[PDB]
Ligand SMILES: Nc1nc2c(ncn2[C@@H]2O[C@H](COP(=O)(O)OP(=O)(O)O)[C@@H](O)[C@H]2O)c(=O)[nH]1
């Protein structure tokens with residue numbers, strides 16, 4: 011029932027983590043200047 | 044059945060902790076970057 | 081695109097005061113007439129312009145806290161802004177503001193920007209909490225104050241832009 | 255804290271030692287036994303602090319922002335090596351064009367049961383512009399050397 015919603019949310023959070031990492035990674039590169 | 048739901052929440056919880064840690068670091072980075080250029 | 085600042089703002093208050101809809105109204109311009117689906121609590125983002133700088137807000141609903149009690153710290157971690165939300169037509173949600181405030185003191189940073197929000201201003205014909213009393217409370221506890229209606233989309237934009245501006249002005253004075 | 259932050263993903267068939275490669279590098283642990291998780295380890299490269307978040311086992315989110323990839327197989331299980339071609343294509347399809355890739359042959363401690371000649375594996379790696387090294391998560395061989403290698407190649411690239 012309400013377990014399929016949990017699966018999608020875990021997916022959405024991974025994407026969020028990936029985006030956060032990417033931006034941190036990008037910001038750090040900019041900071042070294 | 045019930046073990047899957049509890050296992051999922053634990054994963055959900057841990058990812059949320061990860062997100063909060065990344066966001067806080069990203070906050071600090073932006074601030075100290077704006078202090079420069 | 082990118083942004084110049086990322087600020088974390090949390091939504092806090094009793095269930096049913098309108099936290100989820102304030103979040104959905106501001107980030108997606110969407111409103112739910114029905115009771116929200118409680119799952120692993122979530123957040124949303126929206127970018128606004130403050131003094132030319134692009135400010136991206138990461139706004140959290142903190143309802144599922146005390147169901148994911150182990151990770152309560154995650155909701156408040158890095159949060160620079162807080163919306164203390166109550167229902168103007170439910171006095172009980174307003175009494176509990178003092179409770180959520182003590183919650184904030186423990187779990188959040190000592191100098192977090194807090195705004196007191198009375199939602200459902202559209203239900204003013206059932207007003208249980210007088211504005212003067214609420215505003216005074218905000219003054220007594222050094223809180224900002226605004227009345228909103230997520231349903232009518234009244235003061236929602238202003239509420240967030242106010243707190244985000246205030247946060248920005250603080251970090252820019254450093 | 256750190257100066258740089260690099261995302262590095264582990265891919266390969268199940269049972270090759272991906273999880274154990276991660277545990278040994280990040281906390282010096284090896285075991286004998288899901289969802290998606292990751293662990294961090296910081297190393298020094300050119301006086302800089304490099305924080306690596308290593309990912310193990312949505313496919314697009316997994317590769318999103320990944321600047322490095324360890325393609326892992328089993329040197330005693332030739333099937334895991336025959337499938338390297340498949341994993342490489344998933345990388346090429348779902349990841350960045352400038353990603354640093356290293357072919358890792360794990361379980362080098364099973365040389366007596368070797369099914370994949372190291373010259374053949376390197377030949378594959380060199381042709382496909384892949385880095386190559388044999389590791390053993392069990393007895394901790396070349397694990398540090400593997401990660402430090404890929405994290406350095408990544409660093410030198412972003413130093414532009
Ligand atoms: N009349 C009115 N109803 C609202 C308003 N905001 C939310 N609601 C309703 O209040 C109910 C509970 O709101 P909800 O967003 O779930 O509050 P939450 O539990 O604190 O997140 C829902 O049925 C909403 O449609 C508002 O501004 N005016």
Ligand SMILES: Nc1nc2c(ncn2[C@@H]2O[C@H](COP(=O)(O)OP(=O)(O)O)[C@@H](O)[C@H]2O)c(=O)[nH]1
Pocket residue numbers: 266267268269270271272273274275285286287360361362363364389390391392393
């Ligand atoms: N002999 C040997 N066994 C290993 C090595 N690395 C992993 N293993 C074994 O391989 C099994 C499965 O490895 P696992 O971590 O699950 O790999 P994964 O499923 O691809 O992530 C475990 O029982 C480990 O004991 C190694 O370097 N040498």
